[PDB]
Structure formats: structure tokens, C-alpha cells
């Protein structure tokens, strides 16, 4: 825990949660995302979202933790939330290695 001051961490830790919730509310509110689950769907109307608290929360940890997770975002909103998120995670780890070296 030494190579990064014990201030970013508490900034970091809540940051994962912070993006996690704003992910949830937007994900639950989407025009593009409600889809039908049946493998060969004959134009039924059984569509719903796939984003919940645990599902979005875990992606927040997983994306930061640099092991890929599921819930490939589909809408421009949910995708752009992941797109910006990955950048923050990508630099911090790369920051983490560089300083520790």
C-alpha cells in the first residue's frame, strides 16, 4: 500500500462505488438495452434489462481489478460509462507499477 499515498486509495475506493451506482440508474433507464432472452426468439415481448446492483457493482471491481467481466455494455450511455472507467483503472495500475519500480 506504500507506493500510492493513503489518500488516493480512499478517493479510489469510493470512486468504484461512485461510478457503480450512476451506472445502475442509467442502465435501468435505457432505450436500446431491453432485449429478449430466448435463444431463438420468435418476436416475443419478454424483454428486460440485465443490470442490477450486484451485476453493476461487480463489474466495477472487475474492470478496476484488470480481470475482464461480463455485461458488455450495449447502449451509448452504459458503454461510455465503461469506456471512461477503464481509462481511470488503466492509468492507476500503470501508475502503481511505475512508482513502485
Amino acid at each position: 500500500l506504500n507506493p500510492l499515498s493513503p489518500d488516493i486509495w480512499m478517493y479510489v475506493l469510493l470512486a468504484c462505488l461512485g461510478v457503480s451506482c450512476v451506472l445502475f440508474v442509467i442502465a435501468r433507464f435505457s432505450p436500446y438495452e431491453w432485449y429478449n432472452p430466448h435463444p431463438c426468439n420468435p418476436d416475443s415481448d419478454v424483454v428486460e434489462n440485465n443490470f442490477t446492483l450486484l451485476n453493476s457493482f461487480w463489474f466495477g471491481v472487475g474492470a478496476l481489478m484488470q480481470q475482464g467481466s461480463e455485461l458488455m455494455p450495449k447502449a451509448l450511455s452504459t458503454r461510455i460509462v465503461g469506456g471512461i472507467w477503464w481509462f481511470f483503472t488503466l492509468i492507476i495500475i500503470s501508475s502503481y507499477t511505475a512508482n513502485l519500480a
Binding site: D7, M10, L14, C21, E48
Partner: peptide, 30 residues
């Protein structure tokens, strides 16, 4: 004000989580 702003973010997440459970129980397949 890192602690203060972090508490504000905690407030945001708390209010959402309180609203999250009802939106867990509300929708189903159609």
C-alpha cells in the same frame, strides 16, 4: 475536503441503494 466529498458520494450511493432495492422488486419479464 476529501473525507467530506467522500461522505457526499456516500450519501449519493446510500440514496440510490435505498432506491435500488425497490427497483429490484419492481420489474419482471413481460
Amino acid at each position: 475536503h476529501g473525507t467530506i466529498i467522500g461522505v457526499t458520494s456516500g450519501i449519493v450511493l446510500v440514496l440510490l441503494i435505498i432506491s435500488i432495492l425497490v427497483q429490484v422488486k419492481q420489474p419482471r419479464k413481460k
